[PDB]
Design a protein around this ligand. Structure first.
Ligand SMILES: [Co+2]
Ligand SMILES: [Co+2]
Lengths: 134, 134
């Protein structure tokens, strides 16, 4: 099938250090060191749950894509899910053909250095969905 | 005691049939029939992504535990993540000993027929977390 695995659940957090330490030292998760991603305006910590990852995100620089989310959601919150696709270009053409209003039109290189597209919550799906080339 | 896999990401949706059909017929996901869970005050559709599932949730009756979420988030939204643990009782005692204010006291039987506990976003972790016995 075109649609694949859940690659990550992304959580925006107001304190990346504290969030990472909670998963690591309270819950006993496998947690990475923080990685700055300046191109993407965030810092990330990866929580490896074995089957998938949680990405803990915090703004990096004054123009972060998640800065506005953290003003609304001061305690942090679930920000998006990311599901893999076998072929992102075939997937974009298909979704364009289906004429869905949530499609974000332009394929960009995402935080993993692979092409992605975002579907906003505009067709009953209920969540921001990042689709990433597998 | 030891933390395990992500069992599900739960999404609250204002229209369960519309959300299910989006995943199935727009994204090409494997999607269950809607299952009412009256004891838990919701109806669920399971989206099987192979590595984990999405549980799409809609209120069933008046005092649904997600009814209040759906008033705040009219388009619906990510409601919780569920992570497995090998021993729910051990985890509850460990968490009670760590004195974390996110801990929700009562072990209940969840929709999967397994004991669960919830931790709220009160300790820098960013999301509602359900822990469920493996
Ligand atoms: Co992402
Ligand atoms: Co759940």
């Amino acid at each position: 099938s075109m649609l694949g695995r859940l690659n990550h659940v992304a959580i925006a957090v107001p304190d990346l250090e504290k969030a990472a330490a909670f998963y690591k030292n309270i819950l006993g998760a496998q947690v990475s060191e923080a990685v700055p991603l300046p191109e993407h305006g965030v810092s990330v910590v990866f929580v490896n749950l074995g089957n998938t990852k949680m990405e803990l995100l915090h703004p990096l620089g004054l123009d972060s894509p998640i800065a506005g989310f953290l003003q609304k959601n001061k305690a942090g919150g679930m920000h998006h899910i990311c599901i893999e696709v076998d072929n992102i270009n075939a997937a974009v053409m298909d979704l364009k053909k289906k004429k869905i209003r949530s499609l974000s039109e332009e394929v960009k290189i995402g935080a993993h250095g692979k092409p992605v597209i975002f579907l906003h919550p505009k067709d009953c799906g209920g969540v921001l969905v990042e689709l990433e080339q597998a």
